[PDB]
Design a protein around this nucleic acid. Structure first.
Lengths: 159, 85, 52, 60, 35, 216, 119, 76, 88, 217, 63, 113
RNA sequence: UUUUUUUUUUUUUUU
RNA sequence: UUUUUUUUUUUUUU
RNA sequence: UUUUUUU
RNA sequence: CUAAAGAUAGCGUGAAAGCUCAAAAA
RNA sequence: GGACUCCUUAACUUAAACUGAGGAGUCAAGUAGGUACAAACCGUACAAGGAUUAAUUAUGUCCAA
């Protein structure tokens, strides 16, 4: 037999390597990433890496996907979890989180009524406060005051 | 010196800008020279896996699967230990 | 930061006495002295007592 | 001097269709400082490119 | 042991692994292949 | 670095895989702690002395998991104590190991009671008397042999530890506040007070007697 | 009481130059016999089968091979192959039963408190 | 019983296609085992993961190629 | 008892390090002073093989230059033997 | 007198299972450089200062080598000395500028270099051989030499080396004896004011405060 | 002054954080309903997952 | 070798008498049982023969109680329902070590009954 | 864990 | 971690 | 201009 | 308290005694 | 009736720059470059001649450069 090194020792060092496996690429980015998000629910690094990949692949990702990713990130740092406040501060001090919140702020006008409770719960969990979206969320809350359920009203009041 | 011809290995040692004390040790084997520094030779434990930097490229896959030690020398419980050549 | 903290503290001068939690020690032996670089004396040949 | 390595400069120049030998380059560099600075500025524009989207996180 | 003469100094980078008057090259291979 | 050894090159370092599973010093570790472990947050109430440690030990020191700390301070027959009306400190963590460090107990013992040690004396004619008063320690090592002046040690360790001797002079007790100091002192003493294995005339640390020997 | 068997025999002959011969005066006399043992060839083996099936927590015995491996001029490695399959293992069954019991216990504990409905 | 003769032993694993202009070495290096299927049909080429194949092959902690390996029904 | 290796012979042995002239490992035993081992007389080290020579050490080593002169030669390629060539 | 010197590893832990098994220092713990407790005023270091002079054409560069690496510093110094940083560089001549170095005592050395390093000095036809001097001696006697030798061995092996060498100035201390040249270290200045208070003070009820003080007393 | 560029201090940003195996293991344990307070499955504890899912997934009422 | 100078003191060390009184089945009643079993152990019997230990079972719902009297006349009383074995010892460690210190000074630790 | 090798012409290991 | 240190040791696991 | 630690 | 404890794995003595480990409980 | 190296192989102490065979390159009769220091190894769009010009090669990119 022969070794790979031996073979390689007689070829240009910058010569590209052949591909062993090839498959069609994902046609629909939103649908491709929605299924991927189903597996990441405990690892913050996985969520951040998925968001970074989507941001690099597209300049204007889906607003629903961005909201879902933000809620997923917020859910990890729950009240019953063992995470510390320093872990939340260092996460807030990351550039990717700032880019995600900036992307949400850019198209804040696409916020649905049903997505306000989750955003507020994530804000409470992460101890992060903004003056860029909370004023808009309060408008929807007050507008739909006469339609929320009692448990949602209580949770919103507590948060 | 007085000797006409000397071994390359000895010559190498002869060129080391270190004290006599460390020279002797180096010669003996208690110490090694690497990256312009002197440190204790690697320790080979019985049953545990050796460092990935000492095995052959094709042996790394099998070496990585062996047990690894993540404790202190006092906490080590190896039946026999010796320096890896 | 040090300047601002000193200014903040200047507005609240001490009132009550402070409390210490230092190490306890045998204060009685404060008058003793220890000499390190002290040579061994040999006054007389026959030693009556061995001085370590 | 102007925070522009030769490594970058060469590429920048060549990409611009500029065909100037190192002899004239070096002579210019010594005799015509202004000329040299002009070239460096010309090159920098090309070399340094902004992305399709810019985000500001100063207030965030 | 084989350590004094100049026919046993390893190749360093940019030599082709077979400089003039070498024996250790063919000794190690042989050793591995069977002694 | 970048040099293969002969053993790992030729032989391939096969020696490590040539050991037997018999004549072992200790039994193999049982592989019982498998998947299925549930962690919980433990909490312990320590005395108020641990406050002397400060933040540099509870927060600055890096650890795998968080290590919280709180100080419950309360303003001031039979010692009928309860869980209320007294000060203490709460130390909670997910790893039980962090709640058993010797430093936490040392922080209390050093400032409350300290540490102590003892040395036993044996042999015919071996006596440890006292000079007029402290600091002056003399120990007689058998009959006919001159005594040993131990004032140097006491002067060295003044205010850190103290030496006491019983009436009989057969026991050398050491009392201090510093663990290290105490130990050092004790071992220093025992170094020159060590007993002979044959004649058995000297000193020894308690719970560690010396075995006797006989000539053939 | 135990039985052993050899797998390699010395049959290859080798010559040596007698002390007192010139540069070249023909082949020398036979010196000794050696066996050409390539890599992977077996030297010794004990057909004995480990009877202790329900005891996978104990490694095999290789004291006899350890006592001679330093002697050999080659690196050796211990080996022990049997007819034991995964399917026929009691470890799996023990694991299964432990899981089942855990589940049962958990269920019982949840049902006792009455915080949720039954069935 | 556990040791009964009425017990199945078949296995089911996935495979990957063998791309054109691909050598054995390439596949091997990639972390796969090349294989082919040949009787009662056309010749087919497949690749089976090393970590998946070797696990079946070497079913002993201190053993080599098992006898059982060649006595199964692979549902590729 | 200087030795070339270290082993646990007692029931309470501990692998320690002694602050000698040089950092040296050792084994200390409480129940038997004779078991005190100090690794200070190892075997001499050998000269290792550089890593960069790995590619040309292990595996089938094919000849550098191939052989083609024996399979290249022909009468038509030689002026002295070309006229003798006959196609009829 | 009758035994080997006490190394740095004698005062610390040993970790064979790591790159840096033991930390090494030029001096003992109880011997390390220190500053006098009574600071008559606080000082601040300027990192580096530069002086140009068009008329005489002699430029000066004063550096602060406090906590820096010897190798790196030497490397940097070499550049300046050689004058390669200028456009008008002539290898024939010394186109460099004068360099001043301070706080040489504060240098660092990675690895086991403080305890396993020596320096050799050649001798013309000597039977004993070259004179070997340990680095601890050099640190004890003349710290500047540590940098001096590194620079020297870094400079090209030519007749210009002496010239280039002469222009180099290294001092163990903070200040320098030079007259007409700025100091790297200067007395500290008053911090700048702030246009905002980052505190929110809110006093409590005087009656309750007095009651609490009386209770605590 | 430009000549002395080497003496300048620099600090690159933090690309991503780092966590320990136990720190990551505790996260999934908490998510599965084994937080610090107790077993959510055994007893419904505050800020549980199932209740939050329902209330935040169906906040609006039916007309 | 390595000598062990300092050794932690046992819970039942330098103790004159111990009394336990609890209600079986009461929440947080493990302390009482553990203490009882420790008291009525083999090791204890051998190391501290002159120890007076006693337990009582209450026939009515009442809080747990533990009374410990040392050799130096000191007395302490704790609630089993609000403390632990470990925590309890820290409350009276000072008097225990005072008595042990005096005993150490006065006599040798290697003595036997 | 990796970048740092026989870099074994010298300095240097500045990560 | 303590000038404890000719082949003798303590404390803390960093 | 360091990477990795499934759910 | 319940449970478990090899014809006996490592110390010890003069033939003994004594201790420790495995197992069990926690 | 040939000196070094690559593959196979006879002899020898699986020794030696030996002794002798099968088939490719180089030197012999080859320049300058790289390999630290003295033919044999890598590369060459390989030395008619002259000048201050551009290039993917062995191979390098902290300092001597």
């Amino acid at each position: 037999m022969t070794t790979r090194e031996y073979e390689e020792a007689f070829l240009p060092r910058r010569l590209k390597r052949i591909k062993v496996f090839n498959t069609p690429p994902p046609s629909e980015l939103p649908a491709f990433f929605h299924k991927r998000l189903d597996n990441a629910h405990s690892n913050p690094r996985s969520i951040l890496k998925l968001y970074r990949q989507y941001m690099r692949k597209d300049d204007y990702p889906a607003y629903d996907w961005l909201v879902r990713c933000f809620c997923h990130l917020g859910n990890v740092f729950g009240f019953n979890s063992f995470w510390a406040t320093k872990d939340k501060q260092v996460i807030q001090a990351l550039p990717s989180f700032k880019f995600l919140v900036y992307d949400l702020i850019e198209r804040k006008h696409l916020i649905e009524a049903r997505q306000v409770p989750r955003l507020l719960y994530a804000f409470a969990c992460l101890e992060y406060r903004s003056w860029h979206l909370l004023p808009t969320l309060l408008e929807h809350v007050e507008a739909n005051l006469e339609k929320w359920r009692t448990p949602t009203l209580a949770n919103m009041a507590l948060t | 010196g007085h000797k006409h011809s000397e071994s390359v290995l000895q010559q190498f040692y002869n060129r080391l800008p270190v004290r006599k004390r460390f020279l002797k040790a180096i010669r003996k084997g208690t110490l090694i020279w690497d990256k312009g520094q002197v440190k204790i030779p690697p320790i080979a434990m019985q049953g545990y896996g050796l460092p990935n930097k000492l095995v052959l490229p094709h042996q790394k896959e099998f070496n990585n699967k062996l047990p690894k030690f993540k404790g202190k020398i006092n906490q080590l419980k190896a039946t026999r230990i010796w320096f890896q050549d | 930061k040090d300047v601002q903290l000193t200014r903040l503290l200047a507005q609240f001068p001490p009132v009550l006495e402070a409390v210490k939690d230092e190490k306890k020690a045998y204060e009685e032996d404060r008058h003793l002295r220890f000499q390190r670089h002290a040579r061994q004396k040999f006054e007389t040949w026959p030693p009556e007592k061995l001085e370590i | 001097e102007w925070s522009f390595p030769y490594a970058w400069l060469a590429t920048s120049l060549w990409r611009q269709n500029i065909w100037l030998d190192r002899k004239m380059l070096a002579n210019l560099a010594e005799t015509e400082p202004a000329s040299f600075r002009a070239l460096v500025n010309e090159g920098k524009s090309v070399y340094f490119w902004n992305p399709d989207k810019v985000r500001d996180i100063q207030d965030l | 042991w084989n350590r004094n003469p100049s026919a046993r100094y390893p190749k360093k980078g940019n030599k082709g692994c077979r400089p003039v008057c070498r024996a250790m090259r063919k000794i190690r291979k042989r050793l591995r292949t069977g002694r | 670095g970048g040099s293969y050894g002969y053993d790992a090159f030729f032989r391939g370092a096969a020696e490590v895989l040539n050991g037997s599973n018999i004549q072992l010093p200790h039994l193999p570790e049982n592989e019982e702690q498998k998947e299925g472990k549930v962690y919980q947050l433990h909490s312990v109430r320590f005395p108020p002395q641990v406050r002397r440690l400060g933040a540099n030990y509870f927060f600055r020191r890096q650890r795998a998991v968080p290590l919280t700390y709180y100080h419950h301070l309360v303003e001031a027959g039979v010692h009928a104590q309860t869980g209320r009306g007294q000060a203490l400190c709460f130390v909670a963590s997910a790893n039980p190991g962090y709640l058993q460090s010797k430093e936490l107990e040392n922080a209390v013992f050093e400032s409350t009671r300290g540490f102590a040690c003892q040395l036993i004396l044996e042999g015919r004619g071996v006596k440890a008397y006292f000079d007029p008063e402290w600091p002056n320690l003399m120990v007689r090592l058998g009959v006919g042999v001159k005594p040993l002046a131990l004032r140097r040690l006491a002067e060295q360790y003044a205010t850190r530890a103290k030496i006491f001797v019983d009436k009989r002079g057969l026991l050398l007790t050491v009392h201090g506040y510093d663990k290290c100091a105490v130990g050092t002192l004790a071992m220093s003493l025992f170094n020159h007070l060590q007993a002979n294995p044959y004649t058995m005339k000297g000193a020894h640390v308690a719970m560690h007697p010396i075995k006797k020997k006989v000539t053939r | 009481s135990k039985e052993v068997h050899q797998n390699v025999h010395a049959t290859y002959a080798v010559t040596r130059k007698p002390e007192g011969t010139k540069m070249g005066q023909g082949k020398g006399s036979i010196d000794r016999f050696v066996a050409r043992v390539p890599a992977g060839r077996i030297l010794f083996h004990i057909p004995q089968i480990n009877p202790f099936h329900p005891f996978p927590e104990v490694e095999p015995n290789f004291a006899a091979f350890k006592a001679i491996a330093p002697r050999l001029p080659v690196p050796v490695v211990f080996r022990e192959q049997n007819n034991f399959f995964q399917m026929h293992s009691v470890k799996d069954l023990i694991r299964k039963r432990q899981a089942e019991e855990r589940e049962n216990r958990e269920k019982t504990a949840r049902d006792k408190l009455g915080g949720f409905h039954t069935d | 019983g556990v040791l009964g003769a009425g017990r199945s032993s078949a296995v089911d694993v996935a495979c990957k296609p063998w791309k054109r202009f691909v050598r054995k070495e390439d596949i091997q290096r990639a972390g796969y085992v090349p294989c082919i299927v040949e009787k009662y049909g056309i010749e087919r080429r497949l690749a089976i993961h090393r970590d998946t194949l070797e696990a079946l092959a070497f079913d002993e902690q201190h053993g080599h190629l098992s006898y059982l390996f060649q006595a199964r029904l692979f549902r590729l | 008892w200087h030795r070339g290796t270290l082993s646990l012979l007692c029931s309470s042995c501990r692998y320690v390090v002694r602050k000698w002239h040089v950092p040296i490992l050792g084994v200390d035993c409480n129940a038997n002073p004779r078991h005190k081992q100090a690794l200070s007389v190892p075997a001499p080290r050998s000269r290792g093989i550089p890593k960069h020579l790995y590619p040309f050490l292990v595996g089938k080593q094919y000849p550098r230059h191939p052989r083609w002169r024996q399979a290249f030669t022909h009468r038509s390629r030689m002026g002295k033997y070309k006229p003798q060539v006959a196609r009829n | 007198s009758q035994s080997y010197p006490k190394g740095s590893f004698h005062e610390g832990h040993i970790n064979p299972f790591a790159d840096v098994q033991w930390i090494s220092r030029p001096f003992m713990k109880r011997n390390m450089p220190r500053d006098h407790h009574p600071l008559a005023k606080q000082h601040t270091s300027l990192k580096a200062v530069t002086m140009l002079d068009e008329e005489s054409g002699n430029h000066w560069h004063v550096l602060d080598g406090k906590g820096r690496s010897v190798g790196g510093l030497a490397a940097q110094v070499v550049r300046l000395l050689q004058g390669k940083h200028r456009v008008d560089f002539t290898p024939r001549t010394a186109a460099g500028d004068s360099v001043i170095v301070v706080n040489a005592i504060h240098l660092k050395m990675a690895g086991h270099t403080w305890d396993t390093k020596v320096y050799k000095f050649d001798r013309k036809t000597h039977p004993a051989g070259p004179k070997i001097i340990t680095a601890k001696t050099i640190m004890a006697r003349n710290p500047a030499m540590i940098l001096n030798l590194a620079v020297k061995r870094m400079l090209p092996p030519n007749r210009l080396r002496p010239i280039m060498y002469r222009k180099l100035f290294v001092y163990a201390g903070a200040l320098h004896p030079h007259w007409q040249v700025p100091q790297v270290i200067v007395p500290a200045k008053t911090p700048a004011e702030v246009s905002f208070l980052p505190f929110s003070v809110e006093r409590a009820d005087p009656v309750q405060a007095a009651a609490r003080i009386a209770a605590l007393g | 002054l430009i000549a002395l560029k080497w003496f300048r201090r620099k600090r690159p940003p933090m690309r991503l954080p780092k966590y320990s195996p136990l720190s990551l293991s505790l996260s999934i344990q908490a998510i599965r309903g084994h937080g610090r307070w107790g077993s959510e499955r055994e007893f419904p504890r505050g800020w549980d997952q199932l209740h939050l899912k329902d209330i935040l997934g169906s906040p609006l009422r039916s007309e | 070798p390595k000598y062990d100078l300092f050794k932690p003191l046992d819970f039942l060390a330098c103790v004159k008498s111990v009394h336990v009184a609890y209600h079986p089945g009461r929440p947080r009643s493990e302390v009482c049982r553990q203490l009882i079993h420790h008291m009525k152990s083999d090791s204890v019997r051998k190391r501290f023969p002159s120890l007076q230990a006693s337990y009582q079972l209450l026939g009515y719902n009442a809080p747990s109680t533990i009374k410990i009297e040392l050799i130096n006349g000191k007395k302490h009383e704790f609630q089993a329902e609000h403390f632990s074995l470990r925590e309890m010892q820290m409350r009276f460690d000072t008097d225990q070590f005072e008595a042990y210190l005096e005993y150490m000074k006065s006599q040798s630790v290697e003595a036997k009954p």
